[PDB]
Design an enzyme around this catalytic site. Structure first.
Site, PDB file in Angstrom:
ATOM      1  N   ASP A 135       0.783  -1.271   0.000  1.00 34.50           N
ATOM      2  CA  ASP A 135       0.000   0.000   0.000  1.00 34.50           C
ATOM      3  C   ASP A 135       0.804   1.305   0.000  1.00 34.50           C
ATOM      4  O   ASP A 135       0.211   2.358   0.188  1.00 34.50           O
ATOM      5  CB  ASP A 135      -1.082  -0.003   1.089  1.00 34.50           C
ATOM      6  CG  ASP A 135      -0.527  -0.118   2.501  1.00 34.50           C
ATOM      7  OD1 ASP A 135       0.703   0.192   2.684  1.00 34.50           O
ATOM      8  OD2 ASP A 135      -1.299  -0.442   3.462  1.00 34.50           O
ATOM      9  N   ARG A 189       0.808   6.803  -0.023  1.00 38.49           N
ATOM     10  CA  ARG A 189       0.008   5.817   0.693  1.00 38.49           C
ATOM     11  C   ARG A 189      -1.369   5.730   0.040  1.00 38.49           C
ATOM     12  O   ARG A 189      -2.062   6.699  -0.154  1.00 38.49           O
ATOM     13  CB  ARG A 189      -0.120   6.258   2.162  1.00 38.49           C
ATOM     14  CG  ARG A 189      -0.975   5.384   3.043  1.00 38.49           C
ATOM     15  CD  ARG A 189      -0.460   3.955   3.120  1.00 38.49           C
ATOM     16  NE  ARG A 189      -1.085   3.153   4.199  1.00 38.49           N
ATOM     17  CZ  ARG A 189      -2.261   2.529   4.100  1.00 38.49           C
ATOM     18  NH1 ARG A 189      -2.953   2.565   2.974  1.00 38.49           N
ATOM     19  NH2 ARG A 189      -2.743   1.830   5.141  1.00 38.49           N
ATOM     20  N   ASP A 206      -5.727  -1.282   3.502  1.00 34.56           N
ATOM     21  CA  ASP A 206      -4.621  -1.689   4.383  1.00 34.56           C
ATOM     22  C   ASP A 206      -4.144  -3.012   3.906  1.00 34.56           C
ATOM     23  O   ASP A 206      -4.891  -3.964   3.895  1.00 34.56           O
ATOM     24  CB  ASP A 206      -5.088  -1.761   5.824  1.00 34.56           C
ATOM     25  CG  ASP A 206      -3.928  -1.802   6.817  1.00 34.56           C
ATOM     26  OD1 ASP A 206      -2.839  -1.274   6.496  1.00 34.56           O
ATOM     27  OD2 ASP A 206      -4.187  -2.335   7.926  1.00 34.56           O
ATOM     28  N   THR A 207      -2.930  -3.034   3.414  1.00 34.26           N
ATOM     29  CA  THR A 207      -2.255  -4.292   3.133  1.00 34.26           C
ATOM     30  C   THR A 207      -1.489  -4.770   4.378  1.00 34.26           C
ATOM     31  O   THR A 207      -1.007  -3.987   5.133  1.00 34.26           O
ATOM     32  CB  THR A 207      -1.284  -4.155   1.951  1.00 34.26           C
ATOM     33  OG1 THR A 207      -0.414  -3.021   2.136  1.00 34.26           O
ATOM     34  CG2 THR A 207      -2.033  -3.993   0.635  1.00 34.26           C
ATOM     35  N   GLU A 245       1.722  -5.709   6.400  1.00 32.09           N
ATOM     36  CA  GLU A 245       3.179  -5.423   6.336  1.00 32.09           C
ATOM     37  C   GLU A 245       3.929  -6.620   5.754  1.00 32.09           C
ATOM     38  O   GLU A 245       3.448  -7.741   5.767  1.00 32.09           O
ATOM     39  CB  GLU A 245       3.734  -5.019   7.716  1.00 32.09           C
ATOM     40  CG  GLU A 245       2.988  -3.873   8.432  1.00 32.09           C
ATOM     41  CD  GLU A 245       3.071  -2.546   7.695  1.00 32.09           C
ATOM     42  OE1 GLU A 245       4.119  -2.319   7.073  1.00 32.09           O
ATOM     43  OE2 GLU A 245       2.066  -1.762   7.681  1.00 32.09           O
ATOM     44  N   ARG A 271       3.365  11.494   3.591  1.00 41.60           N
ATOM     45  CA  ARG A 271       3.021  10.637   2.444  1.00 41.60           C
ATOM     46  C   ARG A 271       1.844  11.223   1.728  1.00 41.60           C
ATOM     47  O   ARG A 271       0.868  11.644   2.364  1.00 41.60           O
ATOM     48  CB  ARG A 271       2.666   9.212   2.889  1.00 41.60           C
ATOM     49  CG  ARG A 271       3.751   8.535   3.689  1.00 41.60           C
ATOM     50  CD  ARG A 271       3.421   7.099   4.048  1.00 41.60           C
ATOM     51  NE  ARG A 271       2.303   7.084   4.993  1.00 41.60           N
ATOM     52  CZ  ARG A 271       1.791   6.007   5.538  1.00 41.60           C
ATOM     53  NH1 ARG A 271       2.304   4.792   5.335  1.00 41.60           N
ATOM     54  NH2 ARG A 271       0.675   6.112   6.254  1.00 41.60           N
TER      55      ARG A 271
HETATM   56  C1  LIG Z   1      -4.522   5.505   4.580  1.00 44.04           C
HETATM   57  C2  LIG Z   1      -4.295   6.612   5.609  1.00 44.04           C
HETATM   58  C3  LIG Z   1      -3.427   6.445   6.659  1.00 44.04           C
HETATM   59  N1  LIG Z   1      -3.235   7.492   7.548  1.00 44.04           N
HETATM   60  C4  LIG Z   1      -2.365   7.323   8.754  1.00 44.04           C
HETATM   61  C5  LIG Z   1      -3.226   6.723   9.882  1.00 44.04           C
HETATM   62  C6  LIG Z   1      -2.279   5.729  10.571  1.00 44.04           C
HETATM   63  O1  LIG Z   1      -1.600   6.367  11.697  1.00 44.04           O
HETATM   64  P1  LIG Z   1      -0.648   5.526  12.705  1.00 44.04           P
HETATM   65  O2  LIG Z   1       0.704   5.398  12.004  1.00 44.04           O
HETATM   66  O3  LIG Z   1      -0.563   6.485  13.865  1.00 44.04           O
HETATM   67  O4  LIG Z   1      -1.210   4.195  12.966  1.00 44.04           O
HETATM   68  C7  LIG Z   1      -1.259   5.394   9.487  1.00 44.04           C
HETATM   69  C8  LIG Z   1      -1.473   3.990   8.931  1.00 44.04           C
HETATM   70  O5  LIG Z   1      -0.651   3.778   7.739  1.00 44.04           O
HETATM   71  P2  LIG Z   1       0.077   2.382   7.495  1.00 44.04           P
HETATM   72  O6  LIG Z   1      -1.006   1.345   7.357  1.00 44.04           O
HETATM   73  O7  LIG Z   1       0.867   2.668   6.203  1.00 44.04           O
HETATM   74  O8  LIG Z   1       0.921   2.039   8.739  1.00 44.04           O
HETATM   75  O9  LIG Z   1      -1.394   6.346   8.473  1.00 44.04           O
HETATM   76  C9  LIG Z   1      -3.913   8.708   7.412  1.00 44.04           C
HETATM   77  O10 LIG Z   1      -3.739   9.600   8.275  1.00 44.04           O
HETATM   78  N2  LIG Z   1      -4.777   8.911   6.418  1.00 44.04           N
HETATM   79  C10 LIG Z   1      -4.989   7.912   5.509  1.00 44.04           C
HETATM   80  O11 LIG Z   1      -5.804   8.088   4.596  1.00 44.04           O
HETATM   81 CA   LIG Z   2      -0.189  -1.397   5.985  1.00 45.47          CA
END
Ligand SMILES: Cc1cn([C@H]2C[C@H](OP(=O)(O)O)[C@@H](COP(=O)(O)O)O2)c(=O)[nH]c1=O
Ligand SMILES: [Ca+2]
Length: 129
Positions: free
Chosen positions: A15, A29, A34-35, A37, A75
């Site tokens: 992702d 991103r 959510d993929t 890890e 991102r």
């Molecule tokens: C997809 C997405 C993730 N995020 C943030 C929320 C999550 O915060 P936390 O890192 O505090 O958990 C994180 C999850 O991304 P990842 O799944 O790439 O880890 O990215 C956003 O803020 N907006 C979004 O649209």
């Molecule tokens: Ca992920």
């Protein structure tokens, strides 16, 4: 919404992807998914799937939604297209991502994603097996 150009710099995982957008390198991103890890079950399969989709594409495009365009890590937040096919949706349709992170005001393709997920679940694909 509309599509804008970008070019692949490097695959990362299921992702996230490094793209050049308006001539600047960015990590993107993928919205609404959510993929796993890479170290988790189906992580490697998700990363392979998007790597192939992104690397084989002649044309990458990014599509921002109505809301926030970058997350707290810097991102980019977008729908990503590989030769017209949306990676976000394809991931979900193959059971390699879950619909996730659906925030108000950046959820234009939610129902498209959910329909894909329902079909992946019915076929018991991958994550849903
Ligand atoms: C997809 C997405 C993730 N995020 C943030 C929320 C999550 O915060 P936390 O890192 O505090 O958990 C994180 C999850 O991304 P990842 O799944 O790439 O880890 O990215 C956003 O803020 N907006 C979004 O649209
Ligand atoms: Ca992920």
């Amino acid at each position: 919404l509309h599509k804008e150009p970008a070019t692949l710099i490097k695959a990362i995982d299921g992702d996230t992807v490094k793209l050049m957008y308006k001539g600047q390198p960015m990590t993107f991103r993928l919205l609404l998914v959510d993929t796993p890890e890479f170290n988790e079950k189906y992580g490697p399969e998700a990363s392979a799937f998007t790597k192939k989709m992104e690397e084989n594409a002649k044309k990458i495009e990014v599509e921002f939604d109505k809301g926030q365009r970058t997350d707290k890590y810097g991102r980019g937040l977008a729908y990503i297209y590989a030769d017209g096919k949306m990676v976000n949706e394809a991931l979900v349709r193959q059971g390699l991502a879950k619909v996730a992170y659906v925030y108000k005001g950046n959820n234009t393709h939610e129902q498209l994603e959910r329909k894909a997920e329902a079909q992946a679940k019915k076929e018991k694909l991958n994550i849903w097996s």
